[model samples]
Target: HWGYGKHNGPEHWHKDFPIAKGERQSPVDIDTHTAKYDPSLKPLSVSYDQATSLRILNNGHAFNVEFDDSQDKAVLKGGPLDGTYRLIQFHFHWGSLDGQGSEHTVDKKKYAAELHLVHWNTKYGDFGKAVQQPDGLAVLGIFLKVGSAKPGLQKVVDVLDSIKTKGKSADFTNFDPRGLLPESLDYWTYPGSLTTPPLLECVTWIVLKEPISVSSEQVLKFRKLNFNGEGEPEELMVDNWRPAQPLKNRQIKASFK
Candidate 1:
């Protein structure tokens, strides 16, 4: 029902998930000129255990790599967050073709794709309970440009063939997401909702100022995945990203000038 299609895409999500029309929705177009530098904002700190990675799965909408968050080994702190957030899972959004997949555009500049690392506030007990709270989640968004091959990302790409269809999963471990991050921790912070369905306005978005590189050949592997399940009519799992929502009155703060 909820999918990236003409009949059930982002435009129609509001019918089932009314929060899609919320003022604090996600994937807002970041206008650098308007993003104010907030000296009060602290630098973001992230720590992940190499063994924390659990599995990789295709959940229809996108492919997600899950992590073992039973403990605080992998956590995100500082930045605009008041408390620590536990790493839950990470996923990606891409387009059918190159140069037009990223959800958050920089001054109307679109990239080849986007990567999202989702975390849940520990104070809220667990990911399930935390997701309902206003300040429950903090997602790190990293844009991917078509350029040289990303070594860290190639590992994930190698496993995509195992989860080609919806509901498919494979064991994936010892992978560190830190490798995918850019050298700079500079970012734009904002209060926003999930880009996907349920559209809950519980996320604190931290969009990186710099983009990492992914070779055109590497991205082709991503397009090989199917949105449809094994038995259903096969639909290419392309254009899984949502468009930018209105910023409304929300202010976007940057860590650096």
Candidate 2:
């Protein structure tokens, strides 16, 4: 029942959710040369706990992980982000054909894939309500490229079997989300809008400058997900990402030493 394909992609998301047209779109290309490096922008802290209650859902386009909020771990606490923030869900953007997957561009060059780590400010109650406020959301964008195979990402790929067919999902227990993050946390950040419907312009985007590498075979696995479910195998969800958008008047800053 979830939509995918050309016309059904993000550009046409406004049809289902009318507010999408005005939402601040992401995958904004980062121009490292133009960015002003500020050390203070780096994460104040990063931690993870054993998510024993991990659950996966296949909502047509992508696979998402859901879990209860716990206080045993934290990421980027204090400083600018002093309050507690809870991880709500995580998803990926990939290409249909080949060579393109990332939402953000690097000097106009698109990467193979992109991952979004979505979190909501716990100070504002729950995620449903916080997402509507200007300061309620913080998303971390990590780029993925096809290069040397990485074992870190194997954990995510390993779960695809249960949800290979659209609308299929499984309960994943005792998992750690932090295992997916790249060792180098160096990133570029800016104030921007959500890339999906209800396109609210209330997000602090932290895009990693350094990209993570995955094997070519891994990319092939992602392409195998179907958009129309196993019943209609012909309708494959090959590409589920939006092309890079213009930055307009926004200023992108980086956290560097």
Candidate 3:
């Protein structure tokens, strides 16, 4: 019922997740001209071990590739962060068409899709506890444009067929997420929340300025995923993105001038 649809989309989310209308909700539009350059912000440091890649699954909303965060095998440091954060899982949000899909936009420009690498602060002992703190989670957002095929993305796309319905999962091992990153890590940093349900305002958003390219065909593959389970009425999981929320006087700081 909380899924993205005409009646259950972002506009109606506040009914169930009250924080959806909170002061620091996520997926805010990025007005480049208004973003302040903060030299104090450091370049983001993300370290991932191929062995840490665990499994891929469809959680009814989006498909996620879970990682082994038992140890700091895949950790994120620096870049508006106070300490180490462990990688829990990564997922994507995309549109039905190429015109729009991305959560955070630049000067009102939308992208075809968006990738989120989710991590949690180790200071809180675990992800469950970390998600409750104000500065608990760190999500790296990378926009995806329609163009040439991205080799790194092909691996994930190939597995989508197995997890086509909600609750479906398969083993996904030795996958290095670093292959999906852009050449530059320049980004806009801000205080925000999870873009989906529960909409917790605990994430520190690091949205990269540069976008990676993906074939239009690849995006079509994502649309094949079902918001419903194997036995239920089939509803394609398209436009699984929340609209840009109000900034509410919050400032977006840039990593580069």
Candidate 4:
């Protein structure tokens, strides 16, 4: 169970999770004009057949889907990263209120929400310990915009009624996680850290420029989630987004040829 409040909100995650200090956070304003052009960065090819085991877990933060590759030959193709990386868990970040949601910002503009696909290097054994290593994690970020019309997020939105209470999760079977991916694979790659607490800086971020759309009604459902972990239901987890951070000296590269 989790509780939502000003101290527990996304913006103050660093205070609760000390590891966040060195972690690479995302969704900051990317000034394209100031970015150095590099043609070496391009989209990596992934084969769906290699991905065999897929499991979706409701981790409170959002619907977290995990994939196991021990049985299949699913391998991560190359880009700026090397070796075989396996998909571990995927979840979302959104607002408690309707007006401003999402984790990443573009030129200081906030979206309705964002989705993160977290992966770990098989060589590290487990995700918990691997995230501490500099080259152990890969995360893909996708933005979600809200409008009058609802997008195809019914698969997730429909489950809201069941998990409305904190720490309650149901087994979601036969759902293909790949369907959530945006059509455009072209993305901006950078070495950053996890946006949430235990913000380890071991992530290679692939943020898609193109965004997915969701209806205002769908966004409302997410805001109704309870933040209280002790079954008290006192805290409403309406806005769970973190504020943007400085980029420092890091360089971001795009995969648009």
Candidate 5:
């Protein structure tokens, strides 16, 4: 299976995906001390209508809540972006346990989980074509830490049962994505790419400095989802996270002091 496991994981991705070894690979270690402050960076502007929420699916990688981005109804602007970016889908990457498994790390310290809100630039027209171009995507990342129950996250957890297996999807509507974000919009910005193949080098990463909280019990629920679909040997979904990649002279900018 093509997954984030030992055999077909990140290490072997370059064999099938030529861009896996690209210079701007994602999930890099963010060392705060080294990140220079940039006041010129504009504050992020987001507008997501709950009605634009379309469906939730388990796409072998993770459970994603896709949005109806055909129009500018649910869009992201400002921040490290040039034009309007449409919210296409949002997904998570988590660990087998609380200690590790997040894709991006802060000063090499891993978080329990990470959330990715994927958006495509309208300037490029559509996601299918935009991804192959530079400055075509902007992914908002928020880290998750183990703590008390997260009311908003529980909503996502409660619906996972409906899409437990790979390829399984269900109608998921009327959910506001704004509820999932942290109160603080303070972030670190950099240019990177999709953690998975084709690992296109087109993302403007806006990673929040503060982390959201989730209960230990809730983390266990994520592990119950399956990597394989029905009739396939159920691969317990855990550690879907990609490891931190090399930074390689890229400058990281912080939005706040």
Candidate 6:
């Protein structure tokens, strides 16, 4: 029962995935003032082929939007990266409460939700193998605020009903993820682990300083997802987020001054 619940929550995650106590754990607070600014960091380069989107699945953790990475159809380079990182998928983490849920926070500021775009470094050329190295994976963290929902987010909301239960999935193509990004690319970077089980310490975190807007109504739709499949006690998949971990000895870098 490794989950984001009271019993199986983040605190208990280490029971199953012992690496939770690792030094480079993720979802740490971003003290912008404390993070050192790097003028040499390059502008983030990104390419997401909407046509490469295969499907969306509710894996009981979160709704994941998987992409076809067989070829270099979509990739992220620059911005503290040594080589090209292939886009594998994107997902979200959120909570039931109004002001909580996002994993990474700024100045200890939490958000309604957070979006994670996961990519694998081409050095190993395999996501599984990449997780074992320092530069194995890269995740882009984007905060979500409550406001007038953007038309782009409607695509995700509309598909939520179909994948309300675990394992449920549906076709999702021609969906460009660039529409969900903010105008500013300013961000904070650090070395951290995955927030979920296995909690691999191979991810290079790139958290955007700006948050995209969504509506309160649409946020509720995400809460409608069920952790319980059929015949199981109804457990809504809300609060699917991890708490901030210790910063340990790691240092964070800012892309802008």
- What are the per-residue Cα lDDT tens digits for candidate 3 across 204-255? 9999999999998889999999999999999999999999999997999999
**Backbone clashes per model, in order?**
0, 8, 0, 12, 0, 0
- What TM-score, computed on C-alpha atoms, does each candidate reach? 0.98, 0.88, 0.98, 0.85, 0.97, 0.97
Candidate 2 lDDT over 1-257, as tens digits, reads 22555556676776776655443556577887998877665364545554444788777777887766654343444324646666767888888645787878888888888888787788777777887787788887888888888786786778887787767888876667776678887777877777765567777787877888888888778777766677775566566777766677777777775
State residue 67's C-alpha deviation in candidate 5, in Å. 0.5
lDDT of 4 by residue, 184-225 (tens): 876777888777665668888777788887788887877776
Clashes of 2: 8
Q: Write the per-residue lDDT of candidate 6 for residues 1-257, one digit (tens) a residue.
A: 78877888899988778889999999899998999998878989877753288899999889999998887888888998889899899999998976998999899999999999999998797899999898899999999999988677889899999998888899998788887788898899999999998899999999999999999988999999998785678899999999899999999999988
lDDT of each: 0.92, 0.72, 0.93, 0.67, 0.90, 0.90
Indicate whether candidate 1 or candidate 3 has the larger lDDT. Answer: 3
lDDT of 6 at 28: 100
Best by lDDT: 3
Error of 2 at 146 (Å): 1.1
The residue pairs in collision within model 2 are 23-199, 27-103, 27-104, 45-76, 52-174, 96-238, 96-239, 227-237
Name the regions of candidate 1 deviating beyond 4 angstroms.
49-51
**lDDT value, residue 155 of candidate 2:** 69
Rank order (by lDDT, best first) = 3, 1, 6, 5, 2, 4
Question: Candidate 4 has what TM-score?
Answer: 0.85
Q: What are the per-residue Cα lDDT tens digits for candidate 5 across 52-103?
A: 8889999998999999887788888887789989999999999999999789
